[PDB]
UniProtKB/Swiss-Prot annotation:
It comes from Influenza A virus (strain swl A/California/04/2009 H1N1). The chain holds residues 1 to 194 of 716 of the full protein. Mn(2+) 1 binds at residues 44, 77, 105, 116-117. A motif (Nuclear localization signal 1 (NLS1)) lies at residues 121-134. It is found in: Host cytoplasm; Host nucleus. Transmembrane segments: none annotated. Belongs to the influenza viruses PA family. This is Polymerase acidic protein. The active site is at residue 131.
Length: 187
């Protein structure tokens, strides 16, 4: 468990890591005990913030990709649950979008929809099917470079996607090198 905890701290931005720890405390989990759930939660948060990088909205509400500006996505994952619902209710109140039944990860201010972001150590259709069988847009990434999305609408451009698929693939190599991956996958 020490090796993974060390890996996590070296692998993710300290901000991500500080959020993961609070997230686990909320869930009643201890990051030093459930070190795998700790990596998973850091990975997921990272993909959420990556998904949002570089994306903005201009003065007419046109979306724009850019290497101070209105963010295109509200990031919902990461906040505590009551805070999270507060933001969600208010988006719905400002925009007439119907309230989702489960908390999503993001809200798209251009497309006006919530997004659920999945990251799976498994194969992606199996995951897609569990989550889908449960108007919130779904987008799934794998550690092995695959992805899939509700209606084949991947929202972002291709570069932003390859960026995330690459990061996930790298995280895997690095774990496998440190012989940490089998345990991560098997859980
Ligand atoms: O699997 C996901 O892609 C995903 O986004 C899951 C979630 O958002 C929840 C938190 C969580 C996020 C990520 C992981 Cl790997 C595990 C648990 C777990 C299930 C619902 N939960 C709501 C909640 C928030 C705060 C406290 C309690 C419950 C939020
Ligand atoms: Mn979430
Ligand atoms: Mn998610």
């Amino acid at each position: 468990g020490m090796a993974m905890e060390d890996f996590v701290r070296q692998c993710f931005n300290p901000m991500i890591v500080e959020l993961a720890e609070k997230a686990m405390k909320e869930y009643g989990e201890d990051p030093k005990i459930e070190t795998n759930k700790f990596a998973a939660i850091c990975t997921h948060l990272e993909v959420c913030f990556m998904y949002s990088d570089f994306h903005f909205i201009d003065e007419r509400g046109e979306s724009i990709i850019v290497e101070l500006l209105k963010h295109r996505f509200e990031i919902i994952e990461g906040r505590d649950r009551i805070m999270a619902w507060t933001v969600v209710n208010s988006i719905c109140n400002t925009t007439g979008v119907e309230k989702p039944k489960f908390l999503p990860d993001l809200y798209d201010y251009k497309e006006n929809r919530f997004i659920e972001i999945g990251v799976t150590r498994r194969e992606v259709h199996i995951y897609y099917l569990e989550k889908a069988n449960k108007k919130t847009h779904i987008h799934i990434f794998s550690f092995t470079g695959e992805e899939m999305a509700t209606k084949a609408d991947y929202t972002l451009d291709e570069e932003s996607r390859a960026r995330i698929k690459t990061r996930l693939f790298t995280i895997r190599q690095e774990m496998a090198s440190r012989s940490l991956w089998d345990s991560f996958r098997q859980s």
